[PDB]
Every structure is written in structure tokens, then in C-alpha cells.
Amino acid sequence: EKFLWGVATSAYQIEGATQEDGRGPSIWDAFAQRPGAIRDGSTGEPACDHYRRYEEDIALMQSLGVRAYRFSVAWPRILPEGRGRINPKGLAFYDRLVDRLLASGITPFLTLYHWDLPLALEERGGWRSRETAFAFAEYAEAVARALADRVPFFATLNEPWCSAFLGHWTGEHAPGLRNLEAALRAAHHLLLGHGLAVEALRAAGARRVGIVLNFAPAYGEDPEAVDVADRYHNRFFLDPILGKGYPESPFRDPPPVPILSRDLELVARPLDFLGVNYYAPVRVAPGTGTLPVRYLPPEGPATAMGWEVYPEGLHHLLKRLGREVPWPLYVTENGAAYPDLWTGEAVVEDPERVAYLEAHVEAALRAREEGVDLRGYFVWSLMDNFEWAFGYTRRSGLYYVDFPSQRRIPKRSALWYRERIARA
Template identity: 45%
Template sequence: MIKLPPNYSEPLPAAFYPASAPLPFSRADFGPDFQWGASAAAYQTEGAWQHQGKGPSIWDDFTRRKGTIRRSEHARVAADFYNRYETDLDLAAAMGLTDFRFSAAWSRVLPEGSGAVNRRGLDFYDRLVDACLERDLRPMLTLYHWDLPSALQAKGGWTNRNIVGWFSDYAQLMARRLGDRVPHWAVLNEPMVFVGAGHLLGIHAPGRRHLGAFLAAAHHATLAQAEGGRALRALLPGSAEIGTTFSCSYLTPHRPGNRQDEAATRRADAVLNLFFMEPTLGLGYPTAQLPALGWLLERYQKPGDDQRMAFDFDFWGIQNYTREVVKFSPWLPLQWAALVPARQRNVPYTDMGWEVYPESVYQMLKQYSAYPKAPKLLITESGSAFPDVVTDGRVPDVARRAYLQAAIGQVLRAKREGVDVGGYFAWSLTDNFEWAEGYGPRFGLIHVDYETQERIMKDSGRWYKKFLGGAVMSAERAGKVGMNLG
């Protein structure tokens, strides 16, 4: 039986494999064109927050506010990826990855969000893309991973309809500079998270708690998602793939068969899983499951918006970490639904408080692929945060390795059932700044000592390397890139 942290209770999820037994699948089962990657985000890893003309972002501002981030931490240095990207790409290549997903910091290339271009910022992403290609890593560029330029927030940010044009201009700038070398593009990262946590719950930047702000931001993000796709397609070569990513959770009712909990689950599904996806297909917002959305969003919509929200993406990035259990709640109007925390359900959970439920990956692939016009699916984020202990130069992260194995197995399960799934990207390549949670939770396949910036490939990363048939790195090369081989 796999040994897991003390918060785990028996029985373990059925999707886990006995540690002593060989896995019932191999890389070859996925086919030669399957994309194997890891993901990262600019704000969480780059640091260099004021370097070479970069402008401030809403997360630079948010982390300076008292009480917003655990232990008052910030990402001014983070994993220092801006200065150490070659080291991290060497490790990604040695691991056997075929693809690397990263995001650009909007305010690094456009300090004011629009207008004057910071050439030094663009040059950084130029070098980063070239460095990926030199290592046979296909770059996937995410245009927006939550770090809106502060100058645009001062104008209303996502609540200002003009952001659709600002974002489209930014997308065109990136496409013109990098489009000849970047084969895969993701427009937005998890729009429901940055509009919901940032404009309704107030726990992420810009820290607003206002239903109207949430609705305006959500509608404008839906428009920007499609307009950004159109801006890219107008400029990129026909071989480039354009997608966007959705956060999602497999939802089950707290009391199966209970009419109130079943209805609450459908309403939660509309918000958490369908809100930004169905409009891309020309279906509009999911008002059948949650009728209140119709009249709530009415004041923000203009004639023709239903058509503008649709875009024929080449792929959807599915970003799944867990399932959620939903119950009816009379205290939450409009949605009338609440999530039951994993800690209250006597189930295994991670440092984020999320249930360990790898089958959720399979369930969400099945749910999204059921749409008649669904494009190819990629798992663009999947991972788990557990405590790490460095022991004799090694990080024996048994739980994270077990989760990685189980999640990949669930992808193959879906693929064997006919789901068009073309890739798996682990979150994340390295440990990083985990937003409001600071540096506490660690998701990385590579451990980062934030004081020394030393890198250690964790046992989960070593397993991924073995599974993918990664290259052997010499001790001399490992010393040059600052990696501890253990």
C-alpha cells in the first residue's frame, strides 16, 4: 500500500496503483504524437518584478496589502525563472518532456497595458522561446495567467468593456513577435478563477467582493477569450493551434438521489464547469441549469455578443485537480449550492484542502468531450500539493508520485474509451508562489529552495523522467545548471 501523509484515511482512492507493482500502462500506450509536458506561470515563477522596464501588475499590488497572502509573502523573486530559465529548461528536457507551457507577463511587454512596448520584455520571451526550441521542447504560450497590468486595473480592469480591445491588441503583439516559432497558444488561464476569486470572493487580485464586478468581469473575459482567439488566428500560420483553458471539478451531490442536492449540483456545474466553455460553442451562457444567469448578465450584454463569444478553438485545456461534493444551501442565494470541504468528508486531501480523487480527470474529459463540437482536449494542468522533506539530497514525495501515476492512468482510460485527448501537462515544473497561499503548498516536480534557488528533482519528477524515457544528465552538466542529483 502507498504510504501517504497523516491526514489520509483508508481506503485509498481506487485509482491508485500498489507501489510494489508495475504500472499497467506505458508511454507507448498513448501514441507517438501525445504531448507530455509541465506547466508554469509568469507571476508564480519569474520574479524580476521591476526588471528592465516591467510595469506593476495587480498581483504586485495585491501582495502589498496587509492580510492578503499567508505569511505576507510575495513573488518579487519567486523561483527566479527570469534569470534561471535555462536551468529549468535543461531539467525539463532531461526529464523527457516534449512540451513546456508558460505564460507571458502582460505588464512586462506592455508596462501600461497598452501603448508603448517594452522591447526588453519582449526580448525575454524571444529568448525563452528560442531556448525551448534549442532543447526540442515545443513552447505553449498562455497569454493571460491572472497578472493584469496595474495601469489597466486603474481604468476598471476586467470590469471595463474596453479590456476586450486592449487584450486583443496584446494578443496581436505577441503573435507578431513569436508566432513564427510558437506552435501552441492558450488565450486565457482559468477565467472562472480570476474573475470569481478576484471579483466576487476577494481572495485573489484585485481583491473585489461585488456581484456586479464579477458579472461584468465574467462577461468581458468571455468576449476577450473569443476575440483573443480571433486575433491570434488572423496572424498565426495555419499550423499553429489555438486553445484556451478551463478550471473544472467533477461534481457529485452530497446526498445522491436527494432532489435538492441534485439540483444544487447542476447549478454549481453551470458556474464552475460550463460558464466559459459553452459560449465558445455558440450555446451562450448555461442558463438552462442556472436561469438567474440570464437576467443577471443582461445589463452587460450588447447586441451581437452571443456571436462574438463563440470561437472555434483547436483545443481546450482541461485543468483539473479534484472533485467537489455539492449540497443545497439556503444561505447562498441565486446558486443555492455550497461545496462540502474534503476535511469534513473523511477523505484524503492535499495541502490545498482538495480531495485526492484522480478519477476526476477522467470524468471531466468525458463531460467536455460529450459536446458534439468539442475540439481536441489537453490536460494542461494536473497535480497535487503535499509537504516536501529534503532527505540526503532527495525529495521522496511518495504521495505526489502516486497522484501523478494515477492521473495519467485516468487520461489513458478516457483515451481508450474514444476521448480525443492529446496531451498531459503536470502542474507544475517547479515549486512556485501559490497565489494567496504563498510558498506553503508545493506542486512542483522540481523542488526549489527559495533561499538558495537550488533545484532538486523530486522522486515524482524522477518517475516522470523514467516513464518518458528522459535523457541521462551527467554530474558535470547537473553542476553547471545547479541541480542536485542526489
């Protein structure tokens, strides 16, 4: 089988067209309207204008020799109120995107939920409400019904840890809640929606179904604080998915999780793959409160995000997961933000991104050459885009995007990756 060399994006981060063609607003449209939620005061509009420029963007993928494209479908384009009414212009756009990928030799790799919950559902309680899980499954169904003839890979959710905890506890992500019980309700309904979606997907013909999780491996001098960090970030969604139930709580005095009877059996549905998102480890020490850990400074070289560059961390992570996960792994995101500047040249010099990607590729391939069933590697991202709370200030792309003209300019890392893929 062909190992999948890919690149990854998400709908709200690149599309624009936020109020075109019947698109309903999402929780990110509203969150971005709040003063100080986005550091540069920016919004999803108009991201990279990908909704009009997707031909051009696929041609960029072709010119790197990439063989797979990981993207998300915007739920609010498909069902503008989240449930019930279906907007055919929505499915028409993704239908045409899929045809073009196939005509260009590219394997579609589809994410159903990448954070853009329809605002209509959030105003009925969003992921805190059990009904949102059933709305998710109905959405998943309508997508596979239209797309599964040509899209081999569907992932239900992208990083539900961010959606639960950054979305409902630290309030850093949309909606923007700060309540641990709202977060645990959200974690449980994201998982319940995952399981219900799996059944809808298969019933509608999806061939490979999985999920994409974020791993931030924890290191430090005290094993106990390491284990608390690992339970909170690395096992809280994986263990349920694996059918081991939730891990022992990392929280002091947690509130109840609205686990209903049979929910855990629904959540632990057989999958065809696990998507691994990795960027950095975290160094921890013993800390005090609700979550009794303290997060320490990066040891040595760090990206613009202040995230430690530690390629060995990906290798170790893949070995550990290789023993524990009974499905093949895909690294569905890996990449780095550095402050790229462009002043007219035909290429944007990003030697730190080149260094970052080369070392991480060598790590992942090493895990595979030691017998991890690793079947693909995707760079976040194809191009510079809207980076959530960071707006346009953190550039992660293989292509530089000059946002005023939408011109795409290749960086050194694009040329590095093209040659990388070729040397297969």
C-alpha cells in the same frame, strides 16, 4: 502525432524580476502589498528567479524527457501600461526563451493571460471595463506577431472563472473585489477579450488557438444542487465558448451582464483545442443564498489544499467533455500540493505526489484509450513556486525549490515522471 508530455508554470508564479527591464506592475503586485491577502506575507518577488535562470530550468525539463512546456507571457512586461507603448526587452526575453525550448526539443505551449493584468488597466476599471477586452486583443496581436513563427499553441486565458469570481466576488484573488456585478462584468469581458484575441491571433499567424478552463466536477445526493454547482463552475465559460450562450444562471437574482449585440457570436469563435485544468471534484449539498449550494468536506484522502484525491473524476470528466467538445483536449494542468521537506538529501521523498500523478495519468490515458481525442498531459508544476494567496506554503513542483539559494532538488515524482514518459 506525438502525444504531448509536458509540465506547466505561469509568469508571475516563477519569474521574479518584478521591477526589472521595464516591467510594469500587475494587479498581483498591488494585491500582494495588502495586509493579509497572502497567508505568509510573501510576494511575487522573487518567486523562482526564472527570468535569470531559464536556461537551467529548460535543462531540468530536458532531463525529464518532457516534450512540451506550458508557460505564460507577462502582459505587464510587454506593455507596462497595458496598452500603447511596447517594451522590447519584454518580447526579447520570451523570444529567447522560445529559441531555447526549440533548441532543446521542447514544444512551446503559450498562455497569454495567466492573471497578471497590468495595474494601469485595473485603475481604469480592469476586466469590468469593456476597453480591457480590446487592450487584451492588441496585446495578443503583438505577441503572435513576434512569436507565432515558432510557438504552435496559444491559449488566450487561463481559468477565467478564477479571474472573474475569485478576483471580483470572493475577493480572494487580485484585484480583490467583492461584488457579484463586477464579477459578471469581468466574466463577460474576459470572454469578449478571448473572442477578439482569437481573431488577432489568427490574423497574425497563430496556428493553434484555444483556451484553458478549470473544471471542478460536482457530486452529491441532491441532483439539483449538483447542477447549480456544475453551471457555476463548469459551464459558465465553456457554454459560451461552445456557442450555447451562458447556462441558465446559478445565481438567485443576478445583476445584468453587459452583453452587447454580436458579443456572443464573437465569443463562440472556432478554436483548435480546449485546455482542461483538473485537480479535484467538489461534493455539494443544497444551500441557501445568492449561490444556493453548500460545499462539503473531502470524502477520504486529500492534498495539503484540502482537495479530495479522486483520479476517476478526471476520467469521467474527459469522457463527458469528449462528447461535448468538438476539438481535441489537452490536460493543461494536473498536480498536487503536499508538505515536502528537504534536509540535505539528493532527492525529496514525495510518495503521495507520486501516487496522485500515477493514478491521474492512468485515468487520462484511459479516457484516450476509450476514444477521447486527448493529445497531451501537463503536470502542474515544473517546480515549487509562488502559489497565489498561499504564497510559498503549498509546494506543487516535480522539483523542490529551496527558495533562499534557488537550488532545485528533484523529488521522487520527477524521477517517476521521467520513467513514465520513457515507457511511452
